[PDB]
Amino acid sequence: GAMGPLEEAIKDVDVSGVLRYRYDTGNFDKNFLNNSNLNNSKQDHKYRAQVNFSAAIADNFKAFVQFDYNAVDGGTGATNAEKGLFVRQLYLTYTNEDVATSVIAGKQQLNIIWTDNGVDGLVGTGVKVVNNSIDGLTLAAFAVDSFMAAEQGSDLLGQSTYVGNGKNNNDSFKLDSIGNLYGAAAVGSYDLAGGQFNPQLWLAYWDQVAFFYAVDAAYSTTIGINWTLEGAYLGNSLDSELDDKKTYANGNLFALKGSIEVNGWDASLGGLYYGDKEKASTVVIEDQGNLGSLLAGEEIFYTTGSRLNGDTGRNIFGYVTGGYTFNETVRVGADFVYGGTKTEATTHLGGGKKLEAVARVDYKYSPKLNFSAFYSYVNLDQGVNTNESADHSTVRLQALYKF
Amino acid sequence: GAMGPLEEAIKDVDVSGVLRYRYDTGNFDKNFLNNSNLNNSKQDHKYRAQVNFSAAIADNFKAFVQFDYNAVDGGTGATNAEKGLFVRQLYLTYTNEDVATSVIAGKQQLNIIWTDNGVDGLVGTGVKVVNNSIDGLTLAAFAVDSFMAAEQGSDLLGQSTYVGNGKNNNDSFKLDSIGNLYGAAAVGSYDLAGGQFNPQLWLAYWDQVAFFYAVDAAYSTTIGINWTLEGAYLGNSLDSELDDKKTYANGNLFALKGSIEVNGWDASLGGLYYGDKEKASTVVIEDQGNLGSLLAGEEIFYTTGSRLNGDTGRNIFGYVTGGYTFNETVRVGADFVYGGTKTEATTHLGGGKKLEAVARVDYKYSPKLNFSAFYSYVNLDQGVNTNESADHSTVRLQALYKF
Amino acid sequence: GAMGPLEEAIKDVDVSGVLRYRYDTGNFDKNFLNNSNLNNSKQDHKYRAQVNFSAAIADNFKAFVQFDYNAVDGGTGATNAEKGLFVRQLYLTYTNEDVATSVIAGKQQLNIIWTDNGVDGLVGTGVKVVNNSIDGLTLAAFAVDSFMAAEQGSDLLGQSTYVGNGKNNNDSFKLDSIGNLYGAAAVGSYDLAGGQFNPQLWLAYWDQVAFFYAVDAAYSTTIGINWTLEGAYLGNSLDSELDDKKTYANGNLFALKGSIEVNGWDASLGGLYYGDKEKASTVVIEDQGNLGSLLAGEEIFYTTGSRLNGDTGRNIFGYVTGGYTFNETVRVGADFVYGGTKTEATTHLGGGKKLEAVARVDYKYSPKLNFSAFYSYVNLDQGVNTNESADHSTVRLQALYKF
Ligand SMILES: CCCCCCCC
Ligand SMILES: CCCCCCCC
Ligand SMILES: CCCCCCCC
Ligand SMILES: CCCCCCCC
Ligand SMILES: CCCCCCCC
Ligand SMILES: CCCCCCCC
Ligand SMILES: CCCCCCCC
Ligand SMILES: CCCCCCCC
Ligand SMILES: CCCCCCCC
Ligand SMILES: CCCCCCCC
Ligand SMILES: CCCCCCCC
Ligand SMILES: CCCCCCCC
Ligand SMILES: [Ca+2]
Ligand SMILES: [Ca+2]
Ligand SMILES: [Ca+2]
């Protein structure tokens, strides 16, 4: 067949992507409760690259593809990854401008409130309809019939484990099967006089799993003293398949955070309440959902009993964060998170008071290239032996390039 | 080493490709004779993408590469494919303009009359010499020393099976080994006064398999009333390795088709005769060869006894097709195929009268983007229980983008 | 997220690469000592492609990636490779121009004197600092914490085997584990009046393996009669882990080569001395290191007893090469290598006199596209049965494109 110049063909195509290097080390003393989600890296060199292409195919049609490279070179003792790129997203977008509506069909990162919306977000295959007729307001309905589960491993509900009672692979939240996911969302962004108001409502029926419902409201000023306030409730009501088992509970999470910025300083204060004393519950579908703005620390919400994607235990946490930014370039800062998990089990496995301190540096070298580092210290008041405390420390150096 | 700008490097390069989505569902009632070639999709999302690059490397030399992505996301009950692209073709082309001759060497889609010439055509590694000294006439000689067999699965002769006699994997046409393939072809395209005449002659020796010979002639007018007439004979004579087994027969296929187009209407009428009553034979090497213009329906020639790439049974079929094209944009149409398979086996497995009706819609959204759909109904007069009939229905929705 | 035009994005990017086809056949008579490194190809079609991209990411920062395709289509009897591309190198380069210094971190081809610096060079992950403050002089320090070992197979020290004493997989140089590699180098290139002088010094500590030290000096005139002289010493001192085993010896290699070119003729003369009579030693880390300019022939230094990446036996070799270049386009030439291996083992396995003759053609079709061929004949005076000689012949046709 005929072939046209590559130079002509690329004119039709937009591109973006990410290149991320992490060097992670996570140590644990003997008494620490370990699990599939805590950082167990031993001086690993981790690379994650994604390149996204979007091509205007025909009038009102776009095709999108994402290639992903996800690899680790071991530091001490040691693999050196030999991997290629995989097609991580592949979809078609139809846009009818006359009614401000788009239909997105195929393998796509889901980007819902209960999944990670970043680099490593849950992917699935389905259809999404998005309407933007009302200025500031995005309305969406979606249906998903399969999930790219394997790539996520322990991030996905039902695929995480924890160590305890002579077993290394206790199932945090047992899921025998999963159905389609149907839902809808209303997401607002309104520029008001004093600042910007971002309310969201999300509803979703995940067949065989649960009915999920979430409401969030954020308000953010834009003047000297800038401040934000954000609150969220996420709950779910279990499907009968799980309800009949009597060892699960409906999910509830309440969260509130305030923050302030002035003269290069920033601080934040917040809290959250979630989980059940005696029964396994979940807040999100994958990892920490899109809840990053309402959490703090790095490792504490991965501790057994406190995970947001399946665990037993009632959690209450408060936190404060603060830092100073030199020259709008280098921010040095810290997080302190304190709280605990209440358990009804006689073992109280995962229970007790928990604390995390994190020292942070973030260096914005250019608008596209950011270097960062953290040192996280987590302390459990009750470890494997519950009458003794336990420490876990994690160090990360990261380079992050976006284009 | 030194590196030049990507922007300079791409000037040397031509590109083409295909993006195809299919949503297929194929149902079978209990009495239907199933096999490795009938459509057994259950609401599968199938993606096939190919991107071809050709670069002028030096005076008179081109290098070509094809990347292929071939993946399925399961609909009901469900995988979500995590696959990359593979190098499906990789070859060098030398062109001597002074004698209108080219030499093509390496891993290349074969594109012979006995293989599929489309997206999913048999690939092999070898050499091809093509001469175009005589206007309208292409002469070629070729030699192939290995085949990309695994990618083709049941499309390839010797790799198909059928269900029957308490067994799920009966071998349609047993091939213990295969040798090199040598052949030659003369392909004509002549613009005459009334229209265009396309005769072809193909000869090939496939060591350990058979000697293949095919002649085809097509004539196609170009005025109101436009019409085409095409006839073909394909035969083969088995190599001694198979001849000695006494359970195989030499292949013979005769085919004829006429078509007419007027005022947005089109119709076609044709027939074919192929196979042996009692012994296994073949017509093509892979799938349906390049015989698509001489067949109709979708699933009927995949029924056990009727496959063109290895089966037992003497087949006679007639068909008619027709449709109307609105606005040169949307064609609604239908196929009716009727005939049967004569078997000498006491079981008459695969035998009996067979029928297929297909309803079609084809929507040419742009010159490059085509949407299409079919609903196929196949009826066997003799099923697994031979004194009862059997139905098989297949629905496909397809989006096809070519560039 | 927002996406910019691909056409803009590529402006930031430099590219280079290689496309190589080899057709190799290596025959052995019954008495030949075979091993994991001799050419055992049977009319194999071998493809190796690499494409390298380097992008300016930010002020003073570059990111580099190499994609590799390494595949074989079998000739006689026969696979047809279905493989994609893998990320073979991935690294960041920081350059401070004020002090003529660069820091290179990540997965990178090592390119040290003890590894192949060509297409198939050892890759590892680590850090390199390179200083070019003194004109002509490059100073470097490096640290490597993991090796891409699997890709190299028998090229890597500790991963080669040989046939003998009723066993097919005798370990040439047994390595139970390997540590980090730290080293430094000083590499000079000085344009003097008469020509160019290229001295090198390399030092490296490979934990658990050995301390390596190498000095090389090359001198090359640039007038009628042009000539080169080059000498090298490479030695190593074994780490205690191997020293304690008493079956290994410290490495020593001495080499000298002279060459001359006049009126389209070229010739060279050289010699080398390396290895230990009774104990396993090595010269390089991977394949033949960067020693290609000090060797001749094709297969002789792969014979059991003579490998430069782990073997037992004391080797002494001399060689002469010569050829004529027609029109600065086609060189026809030959290599003759003669010597032997002294062994203290009662079997004298790998020992005896050894000879190689190679006939060569090299055709420079364009500056970027080179065709080449060789016919190599190797003769062992002592084969598997030591009182009988043994032959091994190897034919290669190659096409090589660089951009
Ligand atoms: C030459 C037409 C534009 C090509 C678009 C690329 C399709 C993935
Ligand atoms: C209406 C805003 C969401 C609910 C906030 C809950 C905070 C305790
Ligand atoms: C709107 C109040 C923000 C609270 C921030 C307090 C952090 C010390
Ligand atoms: C700042 C801490 C608030 C919540 C602590 C709960 C302690 C069990
Ligand atoms: C910069 C020269 C052209 C590059 C051709 C690409 C080779 C695959
Ligand atoms: C000469 C044309 C090919 C043979 C046609 C056979 C149709 C019955
Ligand atoms: C040349 C005759 C064409 C026959 C078409 C008939 C279909 C009804
Ligand atoms: C239109 C039908 C022609 C061939 C039918 C053969 C029936 C066994
Ligand atoms: C559009 C900015 C340049 C892109 C560089 C490519 C990164 C791998
Ligand atoms: C000083 C140059 C390296 C040593 C040469 C050894 C040649 C026998
Ligand atoms: C400097 C002397 C070069 C020696 C070359 C001799 C080859 C016959
Ligand atoms: C030209 C040959 C020099 C070295 C030969 C050594 C013979 C054992
Ligand atoms: Ca994730
Ligand atoms: Ca096929
Ligand atoms: Ca190598």
PDB file of C-alpha atoms in Angstrom, chain C residues 88-212:
ATOM      1  CA  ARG C  88      18.409  -1.584  27.035  1.00  0.00           C
ATOM      2  CA  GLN C  89      19.753   1.753  28.330  1.00  0.00           C
ATOM      3  CA  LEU C  90      18.025   4.480  30.271  1.00  0.00           C
ATOM      4  CA  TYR C  91      20.014   7.278  31.921  1.00  0.00           C
ATOM      5  CA  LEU C  92      20.400  10.894  32.948  1.00  0.00           C
ATOM      6  CA  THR C  93      23.351  13.120  32.122  1.00  0.00           C
ATOM      7  CA  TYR C  94      24.184  16.276  34.022  1.00  0.00           C
ATOM      8  CA  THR C  95      26.804  18.579  32.506  1.00  0.00           C
ATOM      9  CA  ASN C  96      28.536  21.427  34.226  1.00  0.00           C
ATOM     10  CA  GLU C  97      30.333  23.300  31.413  1.00  0.00           C
ATOM     11  CA  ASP C  98      32.255  25.591  33.816  1.00  0.00           C
ATOM     12  CA  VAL C  99      34.429  22.649  34.954  1.00  0.00           C
ATOM     13  CA  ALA C 100      34.205  20.482  31.833  1.00  0.00           C
ATOM     14  CA  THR C 101      32.583  17.692  33.942  1.00  0.00           C
ATOM     15  CA  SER C 102      29.578  15.381  33.376  1.00  0.00           C
ATOM     16  CA  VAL C 103      27.787  12.946  35.674  1.00  0.00           C
ATOM     17  CA  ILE C 104      26.011  10.033  34.006  1.00  0.00           C
ATOM     18  CA  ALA C 105      23.579   8.002  36.152  1.00  0.00           C
ATOM     19  CA  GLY C 106      21.362   4.975  35.371  1.00  0.00           C
ATOM     20  CA  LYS C 107      21.283   1.880  33.135  1.00  0.00           C
ATOM     21  CA  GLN C 108      24.140   2.364  30.678  1.00  0.00           C
ATOM     22  CA  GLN C 109      26.459   0.434  28.414  1.00  0.00           C
ATOM     23  CA  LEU C 110      29.634   0.324  30.471  1.00  0.00           C
ATOM     24  CA  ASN C 111      32.217   0.811  27.702  1.00  0.00           C
ATOM     25  CA  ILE C 112      35.235   0.012  29.718  1.00  0.00           C
ATOM     26  CA  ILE C 113      38.418  -1.616  28.441  1.00  0.00           C
ATOM     27  CA  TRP C 114      37.290  -5.046  29.792  1.00  0.00           C
ATOM     28  CA  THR C 115      33.891  -4.979  28.015  1.00  0.00           C
ATOM     29  CA  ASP C 116      32.737  -4.815  24.421  1.00  0.00           C
ATOM     30  CA  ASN C 117      32.198  -1.185  23.438  1.00  0.00           C
ATOM     31  CA  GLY C 118      30.121  -2.071  20.330  1.00  0.00           C
ATOM     32  CA  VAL C 119      26.503  -3.055  19.766  1.00  0.00           C
ATOM     33  CA  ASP C 120      26.500  -5.941  22.226  1.00  0.00           C
ATOM     34  CA  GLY C 121      28.451  -4.372  25.127  1.00  0.00           C
ATOM     35  CA  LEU C 122      27.788  -5.199  28.755  1.00  0.00           C
ATOM     36  CA  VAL C 123      25.203  -2.942  30.367  1.00  0.00           C
ATOM     37  CA  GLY C 124      24.960  -2.126  34.032  1.00  0.00           C
ATOM     38  CA  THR C 125      23.433   0.369  36.373  1.00  0.00           C
ATOM     39  CA  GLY C 126      25.530   2.922  38.204  1.00  0.00           C
ATOM     40  CA  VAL C 127      27.219   6.281  38.080  1.00  0.00           C
ATOM     41  CA  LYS C 128      30.021   7.733  35.997  1.00  0.00           C
ATOM     42  CA  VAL C 129      31.831  11.062  36.383  1.00  0.00           C
ATOM     43  CA  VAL C 130      33.817  12.256  33.358  1.00  0.00           C
ATOM     44  CA  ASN C 131      36.154  15.276  33.265  1.00  0.00           C
ATOM     45  CA  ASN C 132      37.560  16.876  30.118  1.00  0.00           C
ATOM     46  CA  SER C 133      39.319  19.917  31.569  1.00  0.00           C
ATOM     47  CA  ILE C 134      42.690  19.032  30.020  1.00  0.00           C
ATOM     48  CA  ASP C 135      42.537  19.139  26.210  1.00  0.00           C
ATOM     49  CA  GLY C 136      43.061  15.632  24.799  1.00  0.00           C
ATOM     50  CA  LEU C 137      42.562  14.044  28.249  1.00  0.00           C
ATOM     51  CA  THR C 138      39.431  12.385  29.576  1.00  0.00           C
ATOM     52  CA  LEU C 139      39.399  11.420  33.253  1.00  0.00           C
ATOM     53  CA  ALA C 140      36.602   9.203  34.610  1.00  0.00           C
ATOM     54  CA  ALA C 141      35.521   7.516  37.835  1.00  0.00           C
ATOM     55  CA  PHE C 142      32.666   4.984  37.874  1.00  0.00           C
ATOM     56  CA  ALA C 143      30.681   2.743  40.201  1.00  0.00           C
ATOM     57  CA  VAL C 144      28.301   0.024  39.027  1.00  0.00           C
ATOM     58  CA  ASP C 145      25.912  -1.855  41.335  1.00  0.00           C
ATOM     59  CA  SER C 146      24.174  -4.219  38.981  1.00  0.00           C
ATOM     60  CA  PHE C 147      24.786  -5.908  35.682  1.00  0.00           C
ATOM     61  CA  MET C 148      22.497  -6.820  32.814  1.00  0.00           C
ATOM     62  CA  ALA C 149      23.981 -10.347  32.852  1.00  0.00           C
ATOM     63  CA  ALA C 150      21.221 -12.365  31.276  1.00  0.00           C
ATOM     64  CA  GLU C 151      21.372 -10.580  27.912  1.00  0.00           C
ATOM     65  CA  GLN C 152      25.091 -11.414  27.575  1.00  0.00           C
ATOM     66  CA  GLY C 153      24.866 -15.183  28.273  1.00  0.00           C
ATOM     67  CA  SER C 154      28.221 -16.813  27.619  1.00  0.00           C
ATOM     68  CA  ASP C 155      29.967 -13.477  26.873  1.00  0.00           C
ATOM     69  CA  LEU C 156      30.075 -12.709  30.592  1.00  0.00           C
ATOM     70  CA  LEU C 157      32.792 -14.020  32.869  1.00  0.00           C
ATOM     71  CA  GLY C 158      31.437 -16.933  34.854  1.00  0.00           C
ATOM     72  CA  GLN C 159      28.657 -17.757  32.360  1.00  0.00           C
ATOM     73  CA  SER C 160      30.675 -19.730  29.757  1.00  0.00           C
ATOM     74  CA  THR C 161      31.074 -23.461  29.439  1.00  0.00           C
ATOM     75  CA  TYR C 162      32.936 -26.001  27.394  1.00  0.00           C
ATOM     76  CA  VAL C 163      32.399 -29.607  26.307  1.00  0.00           C
ATOM     77  CA  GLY C 164      34.783 -32.300  27.663  1.00  0.00           C
ATOM     78  CA  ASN C 165      35.268 -35.362  29.937  1.00  0.00           C
ATOM     79  CA  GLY C 166      31.723 -36.679  29.286  1.00  0.00           C
ATOM     80  CA  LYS C 167      30.157 -33.315  30.145  1.00  0.00           C
ATOM     81  CA  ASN C 168      28.628 -30.602  27.934  1.00  0.00           C
ATOM     82  CA  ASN C 169      28.513 -27.768  30.454  1.00  0.00           C
ATOM     83  CA  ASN C 170      31.898 -27.668  32.241  1.00  0.00           C
ATOM     84  CA  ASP C 171      32.278 -24.288  33.829  1.00  0.00           C
ATOM     85  CA  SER C 172      35.196 -22.359  32.252  1.00  0.00           C
ATOM     86  CA  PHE C 173      35.593 -19.994  35.203  1.00  0.00           C
ATOM     87  CA  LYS C 174      33.300 -20.595  38.146  1.00  0.00           C
ATOM     88  CA  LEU C 175      31.916 -17.462  39.810  1.00  0.00           C
ATOM     89  CA  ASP C 176      29.545 -18.077  42.782  1.00  0.00           C
ATOM     90  CA  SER C 177      28.692 -14.365  43.145  1.00  0.00           C
ATOM     91  CA  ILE C 178      29.744 -10.876  42.076  1.00  0.00           C
ATOM     92  CA  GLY C 179      29.818  -7.507  43.794  1.00  0.00           C
ATOM     93  CA  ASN C 180      29.904  -3.885  42.780  1.00  0.00           C
ATOM     94  CA  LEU C 181      32.519  -2.574  40.364  1.00  0.00           C
ATOM     95  CA  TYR C 182      34.408   0.628  41.079  1.00  0.00           C
ATOM     96  CA  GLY C 183      37.075   2.098  38.867  1.00  0.00           C
ATOM     97  CA  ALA C 184      38.726   4.951  37.103  1.00  0.00           C
ATOM     98  CA  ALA C 185      40.330   5.659  33.769  1.00  0.00           C
ATOM     99  CA  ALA C 186      42.559   8.162  32.053  1.00  0.00           C
ATOM    100  CA  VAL C 187      42.200   8.166  28.299  1.00  0.00           C
ATOM    101  CA  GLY C 188      44.296  10.401  26.096  1.00  0.00           C
ATOM    102  CA  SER C 189      44.046  11.473  22.484  1.00  0.00           C
ATOM    103  CA  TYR C 190      46.728  13.913  21.429  1.00  0.00           C
ATOM    104  CA  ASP C 191      47.210  15.304  17.920  1.00  0.00           C
ATOM    105  CA  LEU C 192      50.974  15.583  17.646  1.00  0.00           C
ATOM    106  CA  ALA C 193      52.860  16.796  14.545  1.00  0.00           C
ATOM    107  CA  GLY C 194      53.481  13.346  12.968  1.00  0.00           C
ATOM    108  CA  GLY C 195      50.147  11.871  13.997  1.00  0.00           C
ATOM    109  CA  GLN C 196      48.012  10.933  16.985  1.00  0.00           C
ATOM    110  CA  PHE C 197      48.936   9.301  20.322  1.00  0.00           C
ATOM    111  CA  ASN C 198      46.283   7.451  22.337  1.00  0.00           C
ATOM    112  CA  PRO C 199      47.435   6.248  25.771  1.00  0.00           C
ATOM    113  CA  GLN C 200      44.968   4.697  28.208  1.00  0.00           C
ATOM    114  CA  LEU C 201      45.105   3.672  31.840  1.00  0.00           C
ATOM    115  CA  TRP C 202      42.249   1.739  33.415  1.00  0.00           C
ATOM    116  CA  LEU C 203      41.875   0.588  37.038  1.00  0.00           C
ATOM    117  CA  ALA C 204      38.894  -1.228  38.532  1.00  0.00           C
ATOM    118  CA  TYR C 205      37.993  -3.090  41.700  1.00  0.00           C
ATOM    119  CA  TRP C 206      35.333  -5.719  41.086  1.00  0.00           C
ATOM    120  CA  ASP C 207      34.304  -6.846  44.569  1.00  0.00           C
ATOM    121  CA  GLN C 208      34.392 -10.647  45.041  1.00  0.00           C
ATOM    122  CA  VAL C 209      36.125 -11.016  41.645  1.00  0.00           C
ATOM    123  CA  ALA C 210      39.375  -9.153  41.138  1.00  0.00           C
ATOM    124  CA  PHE C 211      41.358  -5.981  40.967  1.00  0.00           C
ATOM    125  CA  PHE C 212      41.879  -5.133  37.247  1.00  0.00           C
TER     126      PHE C 212
END
